[PDB]
Amino acid sequence: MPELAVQKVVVHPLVLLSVVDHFNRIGKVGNQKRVVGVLLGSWQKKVLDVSNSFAVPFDEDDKDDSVWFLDHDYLENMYGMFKKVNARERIVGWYHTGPKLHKNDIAINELMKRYCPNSVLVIIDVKPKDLGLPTEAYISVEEVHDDGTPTSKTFEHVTSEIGAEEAEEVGVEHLLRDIKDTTVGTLSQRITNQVHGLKGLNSKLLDIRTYLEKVASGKLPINHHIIYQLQDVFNLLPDASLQEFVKAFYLKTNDQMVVVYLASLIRSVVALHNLINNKIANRDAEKK
């Protein structure tokens, strides 16, 4: 059954929202354990459009990645009720409640194949992390290293985006006490995205950095593939920085002033001489 069949994951704000809700309701299965649930949406296609998600009973024991319970019945029934309502609706994959990527998920992925072809690992966290979405999309990739066993089963991140239907989007606004913080639209948004990138860039460098110290002394396991890719960033070193400038706006404002001022200037000349006569008018008008 295919694992490879993802390169884009588009998720509705509904599925992202749904996981948050399932954590509390399910009876707080999670914490040390994990709640993974099925994702309903399009499948059997490259771009994954996840319509919805619902919780499935799961008790996870993490440490030993060979022990788990997953509800066998749940996927089958749930897929059939939903199919009738919308026939795009199938089992897209499963969500993992993080906190981040693990090796324990590898073991979990194999059983999902028998039921439905999927192996997509979406890590939707209920705990706020990242300046953006605490969601990551992962596609299981096979790569060789020369530090450990040859041919390892690992996850390469594949791009995550968002969708939303038209009614559904207006609904997203309705719940919020805002519209959104960014959309990369006009003058105002566009800058907010830039400073969001910059903070997001600083967070990225630190994950990698902290990790290298730990390899250096106090050993963690390493892969040949990650270590090489990091070296490359230094080697690529930019060249020279040039170009880009504007000044256009001052003419727009300047022309605008003389058009509004045209009326003001005329009002100024009439108003001043009128000022003592106006007192008798104002009083009269005000009186009744």
């Binding site: 399009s42 459009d49 919308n86 026939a87 795009r88």
Partner: protein
């Protein structure tokens, strides 16, 4: 039960009613025509026994025909 479901139709069913003529007789399945794919791979054509009708006011109206006297007789 028939009267009850029919009840929404029944108000329109009474007076006034026009007469019309049959441009085409369309003999297909009794209920639910084919399902089209794309986003939601399910029906949009639900046409049972149906007739494409031209009224004699020089207007054209599409309507799914009654299962009591079917399209086929028409």
């Amino acid at each position: 039960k028939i009267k009850e479901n029919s009840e929404k139709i029944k108000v329109n069913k009474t007076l006034p009613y026009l007469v019309s003529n049959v441009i085409e007789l369309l003999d297909v399945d009794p209920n639910d025509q084919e399902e089209d794919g794309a986003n939601i791979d399910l029906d949009s054509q639900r046409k049972g026994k149906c007739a494409v009708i031209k009224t004699s006011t020089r207007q054209t109206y599409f309507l799914p025909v009654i299962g009591l006297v079917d399209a086929e007789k028409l």
